[PDB]
């Protein structure tokens, strides 16, 4: 049941940020995240 | 601790899974012997001589024919080298940039922390470890990243006494029906007080104000020593 | 970033002869060599468009209540009227640019290059999708400050994000909000400065003309260099095969092939320090989206000349335009 | 002054005991020595 699909790309998950004149989000809690990065020297 | 530690597993894991987490340093290897190889099969050419080999030519004819020969070998094998050379010149150019940011990299990341964003990975940067790879550098960034947030009401100032009130450091929230400042990235909320807040200007000029009381912890300690000064009073009657 | 090209190195150098054809093959890789750069070359120009660009994983949008505390947007967010979502002043910024072979479906100087096996891909990345996720930088910016960088997208009002950055360059947050009616005429009015400005003048966009008129010049030298004898007794391919039987043919048949391939290694070479400079440009750019966009810089004169405050994207035809916001 | 406070001593690893100075309370006990020295001459 495989086979090459084509397709217009996304750009990302839809997303509308809740603003308003007066409301603010304020973190609770966090992750600490540990992150590789990779460079030709 | 407990988040760190975990965050180092899981690099472990993925570089035991994936094969394409080192594609950058890959290509530069595989780059490096692909140009080598394009500049060995290149002896292979004939670029117009009767062959591509050199002893074959000086076996078969007698001086004067072979320089007509070997002189068409000698120009294509030149422009070969050349070739090879100016590409290797070019991805020199590239290998360096990467290198001058892996040095810097190196200075604002490892040796300090970086307020720069993104610069040291996707988050408020905290520290990274360097770790060596064959012609390259990992560096392992250790980031904050706020994680469970919560809808407050919000306000720019305090309205107390005629006169507004801004934080020294975080800003005002209210969960509904009391107000609180907290640090603007974790929350941790504290009573409105003159230690945690400034004072500016009377409330008329603050557009989106709101009014609320401002402790003074100064005040019920002179009033318990009032209670105090009471009681020496009443009882010396 | 800039045009992506391909050329097909035999019809370049031999255009329909299979006469020359077998003479190229006597020069070996150096055909599928160029390929190979101008490949490595058009794959960058994505690379460099994806990481300038692409710095959010959410595409944000704007709320329909425009209350940003007097601060007027409307002429760098979206136009829903326009058959693309482009802004009021990116589609200014559209029309200074004088583009040349886009390469969307060919059925002229375009013309003369493409029937010379000289041809032009298309950027991965359309002109819609660059300003959409320009538009999710600026609405991330104009909502939720610097957060939607660092992690979620944390809502906070716009006069207290102002006083957030008021205070990153040492002036008390008060000054803000006492001063809040002001600051906002203020920038509105240098927004409509920026229409007027490009509006006004050619030159402010000299930056990326000047890489649409490299590309144009270096496909237009590769293309003269076909008249060009390089000693043949002519520089038409046909006339040598009709004129002359082979072994006398092949001698002057020889003569194009090495002037050609030299124009070719010539056009590449060119090609691939231009593409270096391009790839330059477009980690500085990348950098300044990071810093600049989703963030504040404390990083003098990085952010335009002033204290930064903050900075608005505006894609452009081949770059990108930072609108830096700064307190002097 | 140079202290601020969060919690209780039980959550961190490490706490060492010792005096946390107030400049609010020797003002308020000289201030109480003159309030008994007005005592007790209005005796
Ligand atoms: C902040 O986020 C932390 C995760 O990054 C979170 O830690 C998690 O806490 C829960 C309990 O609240 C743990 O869930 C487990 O709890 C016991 C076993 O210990 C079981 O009864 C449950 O079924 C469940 O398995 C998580 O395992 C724990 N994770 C970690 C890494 O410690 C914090 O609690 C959050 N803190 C606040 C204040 O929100
Ligand atoms: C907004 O945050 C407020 C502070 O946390 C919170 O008010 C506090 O609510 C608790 C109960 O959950 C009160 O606790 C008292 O309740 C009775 C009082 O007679 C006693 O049984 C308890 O021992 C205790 O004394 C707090 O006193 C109260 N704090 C204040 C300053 O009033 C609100 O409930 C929160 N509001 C919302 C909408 O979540
Ligand atoms: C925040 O607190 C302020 C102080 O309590 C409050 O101001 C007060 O507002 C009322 C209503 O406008 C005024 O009431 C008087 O208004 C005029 C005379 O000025 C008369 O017509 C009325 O009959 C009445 O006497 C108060 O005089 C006024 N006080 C001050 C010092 O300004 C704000 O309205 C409060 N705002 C919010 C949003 O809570
Ligand atoms: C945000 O800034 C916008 C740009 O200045 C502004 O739009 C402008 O609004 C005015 C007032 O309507 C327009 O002025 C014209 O209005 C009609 C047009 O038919 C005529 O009767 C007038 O004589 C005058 O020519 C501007 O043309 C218009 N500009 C644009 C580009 O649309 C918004 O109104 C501002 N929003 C807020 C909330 O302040
Ligand atoms: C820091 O100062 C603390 C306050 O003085 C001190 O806590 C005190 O520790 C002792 C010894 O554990 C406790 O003594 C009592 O312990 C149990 C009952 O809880 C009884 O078996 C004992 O006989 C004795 O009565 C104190 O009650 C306890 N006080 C408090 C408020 O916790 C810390 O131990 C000091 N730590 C250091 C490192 O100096
Ligand atoms: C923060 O609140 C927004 C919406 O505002 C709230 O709306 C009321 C229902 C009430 O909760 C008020 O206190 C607020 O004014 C949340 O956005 C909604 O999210 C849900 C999915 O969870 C979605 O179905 C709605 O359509 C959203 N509405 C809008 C206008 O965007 C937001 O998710 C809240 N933040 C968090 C962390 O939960
Ligand atoms: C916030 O917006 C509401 C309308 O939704 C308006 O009534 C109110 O006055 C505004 N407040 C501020 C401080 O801008
Ligand atoms: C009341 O005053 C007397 C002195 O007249 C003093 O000895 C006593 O300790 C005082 N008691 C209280 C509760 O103040
Ligand atoms: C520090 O290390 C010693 C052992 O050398 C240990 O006894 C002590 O509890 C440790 N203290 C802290 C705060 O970790
Ligand atoms: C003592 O009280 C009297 C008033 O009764 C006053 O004149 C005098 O100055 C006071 N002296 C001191 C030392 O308080």
């Not at chain 3, 150098?13 to 003479?23: A, F, R, V, W």
């Amino acid at each position: 049941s495989q086979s090459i699909i084509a397709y217009t790309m996304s750009l990302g998950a839809e997303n509308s940020v809740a603003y308003s004149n007066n409301s603010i989000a304020i973190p609770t809690n966090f992750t600490i995240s540990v992150t590789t990065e990779i460079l030709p020297v | 601790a407990n988040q760190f530690n975990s965050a180092i597993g899981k690099i472990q894991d993925s570089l035991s899974s994936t094969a394409s987490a080192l594609g950058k340093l890959q290509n530069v290897v595989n780059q490096n012997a692909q140009a080598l190889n394009t500049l060995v099969k290149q002896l292979s050419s004939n670029f117009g001589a009767i062959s591509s080999v050199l002893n074959d030519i000086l076996s078969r004819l007698d001086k004067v024919e072979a320089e007509v020969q070997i002189d068409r070998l000698i120009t294509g094998r030149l422009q070969s080298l050349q070739t090879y050379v100016t590409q290797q010149l070019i991805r020199a150019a590239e290998i360096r940039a990467s290198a001058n940011l892996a040095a810097t990299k190196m200075s604002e990341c490892v040796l300090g922390q970086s307020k720069r964003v993104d610069f040291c990975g996707k988050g408020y940067h905290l520290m990274s470890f360097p770790q060596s790879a064959p012609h390259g550098v990992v560096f392992l960034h250790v980031t904050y990243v706020p994680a469970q947030e919560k809808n407050f009401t919000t306000a720019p100032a305090i309205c107390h006494d005629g006169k507004a009130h801004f934080p020294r450091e975080g800003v005002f929230v209210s969960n509904g029906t009391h107000w609180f400042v907290t640090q603007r990235n974790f929350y941790e909320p504290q009573i409105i007080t003159t230690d945690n807040t400034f004072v500016s200007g009377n409330c008329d000029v603050v557009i989106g104000i709101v009014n609320n009381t401002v402790y003074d912890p100064l005040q019920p300690e002179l009033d318990s020593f009032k209670e105090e000064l009471d009681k020496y009073f009443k009882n010396h009657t | 970033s800039m045009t992506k090209t391909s050329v097909d190195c035999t019809m370049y150098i031999c255009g329909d002869s299979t006469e020359c054809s077998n003479l190229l093959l006597q020069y070996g890789s150096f055909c599928t060599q160029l390929n190979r750069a101008l490949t490595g070359i058009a794959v960058e120009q994505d690379k460099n468009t994806q990481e300038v660009f692409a710095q959010v994983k959410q595409i944000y949008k704007t709320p329909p209540i425009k209350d940003f505390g007097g601060f007027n947007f409307s002429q760098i967010l979206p136009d829903p009227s326009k058959p693309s979502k482009r802004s009021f002043i990116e589609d200014l910024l559209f029309n200074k640019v004088t583009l040349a072979d886009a390469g969307f479906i060919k059925q002229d100087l375009i013309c003369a290059q493409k029937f010379n096996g000289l041809t032009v891909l298309p950027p991965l990345l359309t002109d819609e999708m660059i300003a959409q996720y320009t538009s999710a930088l600026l609405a991330g910016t104009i909502t939720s400050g610097w957060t939607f960088g660092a992690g979620a997208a944390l809502q906070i009002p716009f006069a207290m994000q102002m006083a957030y950055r008021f205070n990153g360059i040492g002036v008390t947050q008060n000054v803000l909000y006492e001063n809040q009616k002001l600051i906002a005429n203020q920038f509105n009015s240098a927004i409509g400065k920026i229409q007027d400005s490009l509006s006004s003048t050619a030159s402010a966009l000299g930056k990326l003309q000047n890489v649409v008129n490299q590309n144009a010049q270096a496909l237009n030298t590769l293309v003269k260099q076909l008249s060009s004898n390089f000693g043949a007794i002519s520089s038409v391919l046909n006339d040598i095969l009709s004129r002359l039987d082979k072994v006398e043919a092949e001698v002057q048949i020889d003569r194009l092939i090495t002037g050609r391939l030299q124009s070719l290694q010539t056009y590449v070479t060119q090609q691939l320090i231009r593409a270096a400079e391009i790839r330059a440009s477009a980690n500085l750019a990348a950098t300044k989206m990071s810093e600049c966009v989703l963030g504040q810089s404390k990083r003098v004169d990085f952010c335009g000349k002033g204290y930064h405050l903050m900075s608005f994207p505006q894609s452009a035809p081949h770059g990108v335009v930072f609108l830096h916001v700064t307190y002097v």
